[PDB]
Design a protein around this ligand. Sequence first.
Ligand code: TUH
Ligand code: TUH
Ligand code: MG
Lengths: 209, 209
Amino acid sequence: EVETFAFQAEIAQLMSLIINTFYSNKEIFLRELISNSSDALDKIRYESLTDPSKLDSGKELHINLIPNKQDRTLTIVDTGIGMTKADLINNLGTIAKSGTKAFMEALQAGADISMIGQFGVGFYSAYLVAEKVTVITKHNDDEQYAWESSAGGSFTVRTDTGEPMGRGTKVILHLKEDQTEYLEERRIKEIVKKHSQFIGYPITLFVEK
Amino acid sequence: EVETFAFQAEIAQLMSLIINTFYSNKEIFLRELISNSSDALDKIRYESLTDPSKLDSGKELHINLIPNKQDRTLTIVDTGIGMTKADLINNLGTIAKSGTKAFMEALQAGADISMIGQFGVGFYSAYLVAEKVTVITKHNDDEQYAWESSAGGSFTVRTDTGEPMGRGTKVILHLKEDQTEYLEERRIKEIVKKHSQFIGYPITLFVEK
Ligand SMILES: CC(C)c1cc(-c2n[nH]c(=O)n2-c2ccc3c(ccn3C)c2)c(O)cc1O
Ligand SMILES: CC(C)c1cc(-c2n[nH]c(=O)n2-c2ccc3c(ccn3C)c2)c(O)cc1O
Ligand SMILES: [Mg+2]
């Protein structure tokens, strides 16, 4: 079964702002997702200091970047703590209602779209480049779930009974037709170096066949 | 009773690096602490969406900056989620062993001390300016505790039975004698504007009598 939900009104506003504001510095989406993965990795790392069994679902803490030119998708995989079904539905674990409001007030006072991550809602910058986003996630305390949205005010959640991930989150960006530069190896490397050079976990850029 | 602990060896190394490396851009300490407070505020905000009683210990989410020229202290107060005694002792809730190692490897590959927060250990940059740091914290699930360290490889934890804080964390920096500029109103404002201008919670700079 696929369940369909409406975004809270503030998030629907934020998504529409991101989709419809003219803003050419779109590459910041990657740093925001990589920063989310690092946070999730910190979370499982910290919990595992008190309970080492929480790593039975996989001991390696890393981030993988997977371009696919045939599907026109960019996928960011991490082996972080993942999210429960309730986390997914509660705006992907973000404080999105209050962060959106503070963010949009900051935009009126001189802030820039690239500061979206300082308000806890950097995930939604995926819609700078993507027409649709899928989040597949597995938390130790729950089953594997897939969240999906093409904006337009709604999102879906379903169980993901295919290939298990052990533990972690996979964000699949279905890129807009004019944003395929973010599938290019040289472009991804350039962005990682500029905005995410020194982070606490290995980043592996997959190459294509 | 005051209990005395030894830092793990990696943290003692990191603290010694921060204290003994020549590095003039010391003002970044404030952004790191303010960023920690914002994270803790995000935490209580997110938990309160599922359980509004978690705000019975105080509903306002903010950050206060308190200089005191007579005591030569700078204090950052937030009403975030706070920390338990175990969190305090487990390196202040940080992943400090693994973050320190990754950080110091990053320092060898071109990173700079100001990137300390990208490795989850920004708190320890307090020792750029402070000879001693006190952390007084109150989490909903525990009693009020005071953590303290003047570096030198050890720290103390005691109960703090004086003035309750409801919920949150107070970081008291006892400034080094040559670092009193960070008590000046114009200096604090300048630093907040440069590094922490757009964040999701109000920052109030206290003035002095
Ligand atoms: C939100 C997006 C979809 C996302 C989430 C997680 C994730 N897995 N487990 C977690 O706790 N997180 C996480 C981490 C940071 C976050 C939130 C919410 C707000 N911030 C700042 C959630 C991830 O690893 C990658 C991601 O791109
Ligand atoms: C660590 C210092 C002392 C500190 C902690 C908390 C705090 N209270 N409750 C929390 O969870 N945190 C917190 C927040 C962020 C953190 C950690 C550890 C690593 N990062 C990145 C801890 C605070 O509000 C202010 C602070 O300066
Ligand atoms: Mg952060």
